[PDB]
Design a protein around this ligand. Structure first.
Ligand SMILES: COc1ccc(C2(c3cc(-c4sc(C)nc4C)[nH]n3)CC2)cc1
Ligand SMILES: [K+]
Ligand SMILES: [Mg+2]
Length: 219
């Protein structure tokens, strides 16, 4: 009953060092570069993510779509003490892998893993996980859900002025409805970070969208 995700974790556990998040990232990256491709990894993309965390120093981060925990390790390793990552993952086996990955990296105390669908878990954050508002949201789950989960987040009052959204894969395989909305809306100040996919030979990108506050009613 062996899976690609079990193999990734196994490769880390064998080749990385426990409590060393950087060796974990490098292990995953080497594996996915040289043995078999996997979703939601990549050091080039990781550079942009790093820079965003470093610049805004969020205290509360929400990630949609943990997969194997590469991005959770990536972000949580830069979080200040007391800072927390909440990460959502719809597939229980992947949720389990993410947990073990984070444990191995030594970050399990910085991260809460939620196993469920985003539209189900997001409205529970205030009541169940003591969230007031989020400082940063990383989107890397199902692409057709970027837009409605962003609207859901706004709806639920989880966004504040200055909340950073960072969306992966907005070019490949692309999230046109999402891009059109956040760029067209006065509620988001948007920046595009291109990133080359060196082996598939194509430019992808991340979108950073800074929440500006709600659209105000007409006078
Ligand atoms: C086919 O493309 C894919 C498939 C899987 C994924 C991943 C993913 C998505 C979710 C969802 S979906 C949803 C409504 N809520 C959540 C939390 N968790 N994990 C990364 C594994 C990303 C892209
Ligand atoms: K905009
Ligand atoms: Mg991705």
């Amino acid at each position: 009953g062996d899976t690609k995700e079990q193999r990734i974790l196994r490769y880390v556990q064998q080749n990385a060092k426990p409590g060393d998040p950087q060796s974990v990232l490098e292990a995953i990256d080497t594996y996915c570069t040289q043995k078999e491709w996997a979703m939601n990894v990549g050091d080039a993309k990781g550079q942009i993510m790093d820079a965003v965390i470093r610049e805004y120093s969020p205290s509360l981060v929400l990630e949609l779509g943990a997969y194997c925990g590469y991005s959770a390790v990536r972000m949580a390793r830069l979080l200040q003490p007391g800072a927390r990552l909440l990460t959502m993952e719809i597939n229980p086996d992947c949720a389990a892998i993410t947990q073990q990955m984070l444990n191995f990296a030594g970050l399990q105390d910085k991260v809460t893993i939620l196993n469920g669908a985003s539209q189900d878990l997001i409205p529970q954050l205030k009541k169940k996980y003591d969230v007031d508002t989020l400082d940063m949201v990383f989107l890397d789950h199902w692409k057709d859900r970027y837009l409605p989960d962003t609207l859901l987040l706004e709806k639920c009052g989880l966004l504040r002025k200055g909340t950073v959204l960072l969306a992966d894969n907005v070019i490949v395989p692309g999230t046109p409805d999402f891009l059109a909305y956040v760029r067209g809306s006065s509620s988001f100040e948007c920046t595009h970070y291109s990133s080359y996919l060196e082996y598939m030979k194509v430019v992808d990108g991340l979108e950073k969208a800074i929440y500006q506050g709600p659209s105000s009613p007409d006078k």
